Amino acid sequence: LDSLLGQEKERFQVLPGRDKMLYVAAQNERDTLWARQVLARGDYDKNARVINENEENKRISIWLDTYYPQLAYYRIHFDEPRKPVFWLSRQRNTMSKKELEVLSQKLRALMPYADSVNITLMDDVTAAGQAEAGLKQQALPYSRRNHKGGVTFVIQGALDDVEILRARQFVDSYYRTWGGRYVQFAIELKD
């Protein structure tokens, strides 16, 4: 295991994949750069590869939005890099725990380096609850415009440089933990 010449090796999340391929899902750009540049230094090809969470997040919207399209998932929770928790809807889901047993392998089919991928059922009544309570916490209005598969929230008012950030920073993490479709966000600007 690494088994690279691309030092420094600090913060390297390097682990072997499903078909014996060392992926490097590091959290920093310079930490993937050090592992990506060396790939041609010492002929660390084929077996040694370098990935990231940004592409894995795309995979969520490409392979997992179409494999169980009915399953209302949120997002692969990277709390445990070795076994990320795959937050699901509690009542908007379609895959039972018997079927989720197979989804976990598919989840690893998009994340071979991880030992596994956990799966949980998270309340969809609290997905909306965080949206309603978070904007309210952030001192912001919001509408309840129902779209297919969720409820679009529309924040009335020409929010200023920072008040508008209140919701931009909120939603930034919301869709990474509560899905980007169950509640659509929008800020209506006026006056």
Q: CA 20 to CA 33: how far, in whole Å?
A: 22
Helix, strand, or coil (residue 41): coil
41 binds its own copies (CB under 8 A): no
Torsion of CA 22, 24, 30, 33, to 10 degrees: 40
133 binds its own copies (CB under 8 A): yes
1 binds its own copies (CB under 8 A): no
> In three state form, how does the secondary structure of 91-123 look?
CCCCCCHHHHHHHHHHHHHCCCCCCCCEEEEEC
Minimum CB distance to its own copies smaller for 28 or for 137: 137
Q: Which of 108, 134, 178, 187 is close enough to bind its own copies by CB under 8 A?
A: 134
Q: CA 181 to CA 21: how far, in whole Å?
A: 33
Minimum CB distance to its own copies smaller for 113 or for 182: 182
Minimum CB distance to its own copies smaller for 5 or for 97: 5
Tokens of 185: 């966000």
Enumerate residues 96-115 that contact its own copies by CB under 8 A.
none
42 binds its own copies (CB under 8 A): no
Q: Which of 145, 165, 172, 189 is close enough to bind its own copies by CB under 8 A?
A: 145
CA angle 32-38-42, nearest 5°? 150
Q: CA 67 to CA 65: how far, in whole Å?
A: 6
190 binds its own copies (CB under 8 A): no
84 binds its own copies (CB under 8 A): no
179 binds its own copies (CB under 8 A): no
152 binds its own copies (CB under 8 A): yes
Enumerate residues 156-175 that contact its own copies by CB under 8 A.
none
Q: Which of 20, 98, 148, 190 is close enough to bind its own copies by CB under 8 A?
A: 148
Contacts within 8 Å (CB) and 24+ apart, 128-134 = 128/182, 128/183, 130/174, 130/178, 131/174, 131/178, 131/183, 131/185, 134/170, 134/174
Contact residues for its own copies (CB under 8 A)? 66, 79, 133-134, 136-139, 145, 147-149, 152, 181, 184
